[PDB]
Amino acid sequence: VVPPRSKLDSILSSGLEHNIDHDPLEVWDKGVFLNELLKQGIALSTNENGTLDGELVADEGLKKGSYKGTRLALTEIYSILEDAAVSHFDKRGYEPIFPVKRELDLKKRIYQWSDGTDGYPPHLKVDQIFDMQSKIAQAVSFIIPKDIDHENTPYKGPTLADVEKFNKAQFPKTADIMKGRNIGEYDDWYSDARFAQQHFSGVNPSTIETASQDKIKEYISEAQKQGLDKVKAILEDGKDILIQDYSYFREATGATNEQIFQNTVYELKGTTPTGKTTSRYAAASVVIFQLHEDGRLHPLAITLDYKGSLDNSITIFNRRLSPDDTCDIAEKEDWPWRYAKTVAQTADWARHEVATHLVDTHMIEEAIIVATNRIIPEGELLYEILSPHWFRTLSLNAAARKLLVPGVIARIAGFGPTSPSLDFKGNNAFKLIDWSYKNFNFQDKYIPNDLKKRGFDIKGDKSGKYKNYPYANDMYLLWGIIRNFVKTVIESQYTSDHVVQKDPYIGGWCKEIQTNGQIPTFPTITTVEQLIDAVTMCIHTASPQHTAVNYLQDYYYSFVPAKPPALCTPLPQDLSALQGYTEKDLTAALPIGTEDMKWKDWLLAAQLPELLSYDYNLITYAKSLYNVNKNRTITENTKFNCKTIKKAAADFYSHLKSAGVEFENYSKGQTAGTVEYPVLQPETT
Amino acid sequence: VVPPRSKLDSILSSGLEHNIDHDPLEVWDKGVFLNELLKQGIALSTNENGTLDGELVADEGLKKGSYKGTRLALTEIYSILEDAAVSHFDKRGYEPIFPVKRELDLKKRIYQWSDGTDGYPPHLKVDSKIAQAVSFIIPKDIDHENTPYKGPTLADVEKFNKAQFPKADIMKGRNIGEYDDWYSDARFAQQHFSGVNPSTIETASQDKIKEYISEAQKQGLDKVKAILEDGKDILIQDYSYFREATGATNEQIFQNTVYELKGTTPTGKTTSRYAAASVVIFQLHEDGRLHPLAITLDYKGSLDNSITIFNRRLSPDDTCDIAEKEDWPWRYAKTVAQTADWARHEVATHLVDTHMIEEAIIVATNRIIPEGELLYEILSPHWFRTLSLNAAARKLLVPGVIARIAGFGPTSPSLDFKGNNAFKLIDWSYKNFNFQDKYIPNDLKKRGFDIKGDKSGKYKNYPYANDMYLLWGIIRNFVKTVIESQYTSDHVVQKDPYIGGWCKEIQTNGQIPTFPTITTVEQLIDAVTMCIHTASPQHTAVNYLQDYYYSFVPAKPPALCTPLPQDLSALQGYTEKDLTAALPIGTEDMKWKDWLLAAQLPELLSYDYNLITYAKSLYNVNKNFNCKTIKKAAADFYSHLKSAGVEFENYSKGQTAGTVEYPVLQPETT
Numbered sequence A: 001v002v003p004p005r006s007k008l009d010s011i012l013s014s015g016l017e018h019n020i021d022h023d024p025l026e027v028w029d030k031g032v033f034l035n036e037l038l039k040q041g042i043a044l045s046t047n048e049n050g051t052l053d054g055e056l057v058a059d060e061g062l063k064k065g066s067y068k069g070t071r072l073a074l075t076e077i078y079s080i081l082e083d084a085a086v087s088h089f090d091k092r093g094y095e096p097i098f099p100v101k102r103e104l105d106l107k108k109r110i111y112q113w114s115d116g117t118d119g120y121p122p123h124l125k126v127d128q129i130f131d132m133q134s135k136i137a138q139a140v141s142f143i144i145p146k147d148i149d150h151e152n153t154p155y156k157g158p159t160l161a162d163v164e165k166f167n168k169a170q171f172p173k174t175a176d177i178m179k180g181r182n183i184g185e186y187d188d189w190y191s192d193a194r195f196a197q198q199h200f201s202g203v204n205p206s207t208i209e210t211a212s213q214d215k216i217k218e219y220i221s222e223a224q225k226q227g228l229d230k231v232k233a234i235l236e237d238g239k240d241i242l243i244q245d246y247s248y249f250r251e252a253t254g255a256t257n258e259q260i261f262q263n264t265v266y267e268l269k270g271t272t273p274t275g276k277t278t279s280r281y282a283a284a285s286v287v288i289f290q291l292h293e294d295g296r297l298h299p300l301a302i303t304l305d306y307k308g309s310l311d312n313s314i315t316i317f318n319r320r321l322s323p324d325d326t327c328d329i330a331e332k333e334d335w336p337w338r339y340a341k342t343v344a345q346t347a348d349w350a351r352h353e354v355a356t357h358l359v360d361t362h363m364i365e366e367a368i369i370v371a372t373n374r375i376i377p378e379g380e381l382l383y384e385i386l387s388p389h390w391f392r393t394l395s396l397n398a399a400a401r402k403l404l405v406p407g408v409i410a411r412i413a414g415f416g417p418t419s420p421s422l423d424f425k426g427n428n429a430f431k432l433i434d435w436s437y438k439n440f441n442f443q444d445k446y447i448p449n450d451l452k453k454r455g456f457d458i459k460g461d462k463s464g465k466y467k468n469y470p471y472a473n474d475m476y477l478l479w480g481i482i483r484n485f486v487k488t489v490i491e492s493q494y495t496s497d498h499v500v501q502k503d504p505y506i507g508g509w510c511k512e513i514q515t516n517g518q519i520p521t522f523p524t525i526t527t528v529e530q531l532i533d534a535v536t537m538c539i540h541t542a543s544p545q546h547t548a549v550n551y552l553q554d555y556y557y558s559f560v561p562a563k564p565p566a567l568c569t570p571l572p573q574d575l576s577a578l579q580g581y582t583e584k585d586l587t588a589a590l591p592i593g594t595e596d597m598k599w600k601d602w603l604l605a606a607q608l609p610e611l612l613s614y615d616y617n618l619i620t621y622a623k624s625l626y627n628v629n630k631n632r633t634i635t636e637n638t639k640f641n642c643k644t645i646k647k648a649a650a651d652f653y654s655h656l657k658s659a660g661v662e663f664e665n666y667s668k669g670q671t672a673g674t675v676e677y678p679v680l681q682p683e684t685t
Numbered sequence B: 001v002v003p004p005r006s007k008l009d010s011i012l013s014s015g016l017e018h019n020i021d022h023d024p025l026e027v028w029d030k031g032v033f034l035n036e037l038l039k040q041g042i043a044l045s046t047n048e049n050g051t052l053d054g055e056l057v058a059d060e061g062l063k064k065g066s067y068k069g070t071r072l073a074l075t076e077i078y079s080i081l082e083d084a085a086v087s088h089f090d091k092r093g094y095e096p097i098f099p100v101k102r103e104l105d106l107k108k109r110i111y112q113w114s115d116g117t118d119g120y121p122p123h124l125k126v127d128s129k130i131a132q133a134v135s136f137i138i139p140k141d142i143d144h145e146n147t148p149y150k151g152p153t154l155a156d157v158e159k160f161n162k163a164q165f166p167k168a169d170i171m172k173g174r175n176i177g178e179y180d181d182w183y184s185d186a187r188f189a190q191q192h193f194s195g196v197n198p199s200t201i202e203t204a205s206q207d208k209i210k211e212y213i214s215e216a217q218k219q220g221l222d223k224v225k226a227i228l229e230d231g232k233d234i235l236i237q238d239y240s241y242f243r244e245a246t247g248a249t250n251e252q253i254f255q256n257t258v259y260e261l262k263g264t265t266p267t268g269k270t271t272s273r274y275a276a277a278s279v280v281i282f283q284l285h286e287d288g289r290l291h292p293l294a295i296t297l298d299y300k301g302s303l304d305n306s307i308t309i310f311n312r313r314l315s316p317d318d319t320c321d322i323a324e325k326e327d328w329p330w331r332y333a334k335t336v337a338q339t340a341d342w343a344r345h346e347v348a349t350h351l352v353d354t355h356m357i358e359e360a361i362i363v364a365t366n367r368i369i370p371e372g373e374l375l376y377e378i379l380s381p382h383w384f385r386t387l388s389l390n391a392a393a394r395k396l397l398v399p400g401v402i403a404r405i406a407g408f409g410p411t412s413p414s415l416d417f418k419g420n421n422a423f424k425l426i427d428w429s430y431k432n433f434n435f436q437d438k439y440i441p442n443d444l445k446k447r448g449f450d451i452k453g454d455k456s457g458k459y460k461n462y463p464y465a466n467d468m469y470l471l472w473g474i475i476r477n478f479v480k481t482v483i484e485s486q487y488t489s490d491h492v493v494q495k496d497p498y499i500g501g502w503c504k505e506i507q508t509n510g511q512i513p514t515f516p517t518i519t520t521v522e523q524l525i526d527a528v529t530m531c532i533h534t535a536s537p538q539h540t541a542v543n544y545l546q547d548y549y550y551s552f553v554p555a556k557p558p559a560l561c562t563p564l565p566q567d568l569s570a571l572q573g574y575t576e577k578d579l580t581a582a583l584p585i586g587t588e589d590m591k592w593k594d595w596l597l598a599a600q601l602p603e604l605l606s607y608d609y610n611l612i613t614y615a616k617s618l619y620n621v622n623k624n625f626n627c628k629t630i631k632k633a634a635a636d637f638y639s640h641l642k643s644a645g646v647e648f649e650n651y652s653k654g655q656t657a658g659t660v661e662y663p664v665l666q667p668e669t670t
């Protein structure tokens, strides 16, 4: 044997065999991170008596850092803030960690309504770090250095081919797989096909709708003005013309048809503006599509920024009038049209992250959670069936309110008017949240109601023209299966409309949600059918809908050029300027290169999806419900038969597994080359 | 095309395609679990004020359940308790979640010393019924069908054990029962070198060898007497100290009388478990194979007053017309020795030597060294959320699990924690820990192992020792580079405002007088190396394969379910049925509970925590004392760790063929 002392001497005395620079950081050692935040004064300061003095120790943020180090630092500080929220929510009795018996009367005192003066729709009143009265956003701004190393970054470029090459080289390996890649895996990520497909199977699949006759007539007139006879004939024919309408952004912000969307970002030295500014731009875009009989959604027209009418706007029409159409200009080299698609993507980033995700799943659900906790006692069937879908939701939403919206979304959006905003009330991101919350319709977003209102005959169509809409096909199935389970459970106790109407809690529950919760579209439940649909909607909102709009966040956003949050240059002044656009015009509009603080925009655009990500599923739920109701004797509860709950859970489990097979078929049944849709695989939701 | 409405109608209207009973529960939906605990009154009760009234809602625990459902419920409630501890430790400022600047004077007020009236060595003063909550999750009775303890034979539990295996990564989800010859002399002895307690075996003193020479003379075993007289590499695992540790006389037996409770009230029904202050004598052969020669079941002052059995097999290669499998007296002896190692491992090697020793140093560090200091910055990352987990362990693991399945008693539950022999064993182990003697180089030398310089290959089956010599040397090198960046001479140490008080705080309030009076750079480096060793690789070494070595209970049970044999004569008559009665096998004598808790303990002690992640993190912050030196130290440490990782593999593969793997220190394991 060569003895241990010789193996030790040989390792210490020889040159290094392993170069640490060739081994990128994947995880922060949590203890080293906490020490470094403290060393850099990115920490709460205290008086001698051990209380917080409301300040941070540091006057200014980090001088210097790396892309990878900052990205990981942002995830780490967010996950720390989420841990702090859980701890505070435990301390305050909002979400106890160890189970505690609380009479309803105690819960009415614990769970209060916020008053709206924080700029948010009504949520849990939050009264350690959560003990003060928006400085937590200053701590995050300090983690983003003044400047970073631009070498071997995803934004460096300086060309699109350069960022594409870098993007591909970062993929691991040789549903699980899809998560750790992005749409840039496709060389034709920019294509009409993959652009339009996102409106059916991307992170925002539930807002595309049938174009009204009024809208089609606007686009008929605009095509007449541009002398485009072919596209005018397609619209006049009017065969399955669809719209993604983002024109409401102006109504939502109180912006006039003369005002442009601009975010003027002020560089800060601590709290003090340096005078250096960065401008980002948004657009209330409109996309017109045609759904072909073969199932392929084709984009026909994009209005960059809809300003009251098409007469007062810039509308470009696709050179290609069907999916297979050709012309002497390749899709890759059609820069005016690629610019238009990129603008429409910025619009969908806003609608997705603010409305479809934050409002429609988190803030709507929080009102219902608070209302439920205040009105329905913990012993009740209604509480037992809803509450498991709400585990640690209130604490995560508190973290999101303090950091995500003001610190990230308000920064990379192009609505402004300024970042940081001195007040919430001038800030267009907050107005968009307010408007989206006020204009959410709880019953219209019941899956069967939603699909019909948006003009999709998913129920009965046998043409196969919805084969590229797996969100809709999967959701029709999944809703029906969740409703079946809710039906079996609810009817165990609620044997007639009379039992609903005489219920001590349901009446007050609906009123609490409608008034204090400010969801007047929540039903006044007087029937078993209404009770089933409301409960189905709550479970849908909490689990599969949230999964659908969140699971592939990283896939669709992390390669920023495919779906940027905002434009880095002004819109073209008129249609003439747009038609002259080249590769350089689209590149300048994207956060590519080492100028104009664009590294920060790329970092935060790629980071947001990560912050919203990193057995929380219906199968685990079903097995768990089955298990406790196998263990229950029949005497225990008298309002419902727990053997029926056991039966419902067994049924639900099997129905979910069966549906999982169909979700696969609907994904594989898409037209050749279409991106996979594995987001609802039952042990995913 | 067949539309969605038809696929929905077809799934709802058809018989179920999937039977949920054929899909075992692996994860609790956390919300359903919390609701069910609340429904069963397994929850804290409150006054109108919203305050805790100190009681649980439920007066009695669950009536009925399954082995698998209870096991999963125990892990789930423990992980909840750990979350609650983190939340409390955040609330009280003990371990803030969000970073906060605290002046030293504030920290002296936050971090106080416990006074020992809780029965524990000195620890953090925190500011019970939480133990009653866990006892309620264990039902009064369970379903015995398709359980690992049912048996009723050893072959039956062996068959069940093997069938439950799934599919370093692999080793985790299996156990020593994967080997048909788990009971063998080879795999028994090997655990003293590469099991969960590899750091207590030692060179046998001349006095001890002379006792065993005399006992072999009494039994007329000429061959074994000649081997001992020759005295070539005779090693000892000595557990005789259990009597000194508990104040037990040589006339008293170790017994745990377990009282059946209806809520809190004894029914009068009891179950007995038995422990033994065993001694194992081994010979290390030149080829590296550790061979067990003799086991004293329970050492009671002398061998004259004890029961000592000597192996029929005098070398590893020996064959007797009685196969190892059918040598029930010897298999019984090995099983008794295993109970002794369970206690020494879980109490001393794990709980005291890594957690409680470390906690004193953490408290002392927080009270004396300000957060700005290099000493605080180098130590504190290795202590992330340790204080909260230790509090959970003090409230639940020791009184509720370890004191229940151990055979020391005198009774479970104990009204008086100071009168409980498990707590006396903790106290004794803490008082007799030698901080400087457990420096790896000091430890190997004191226990009589020439790991440093040996070229015979006789330590090829001691990968813990070989790996640790390397790893200690590498950690020390990193600590050296970092410490010397500020501590440029002994003078800078001696003039340090904090180090003097730090040492005194640990020695007095911390009750670790073996902690050095640090007046030199070399002493400072070794102390800091020891803290990092204790926090990371030593802890990993004694904890990582806990499940592998304990979860198949017959291979290493926590206690005996029957009394020891009366005398050597009785022991030599033992059969398969005698060993089986001693193990928690079958549906009688509450043995299902012992198996459940024995297999559960390792799991509860398991719920990128490594030196590679640490090194890369330190390197990265020091890309932006001379902090370029810290960057250099971290780069060096990273590379040295990777290089060592290759050697750890070689030392594992270099073991005599068929020896169990040792992947416990693979640098992204630590």
Ligand SMILES: [Fe+2]
Pocket: A357, A362, A546, A550, A612
């Ligand atoms: Fe979310």
Ligand SMILES: [Fe+2]
Pocket: B350, B355, B539, B543, B605
């Ligand atoms: Fe441990």
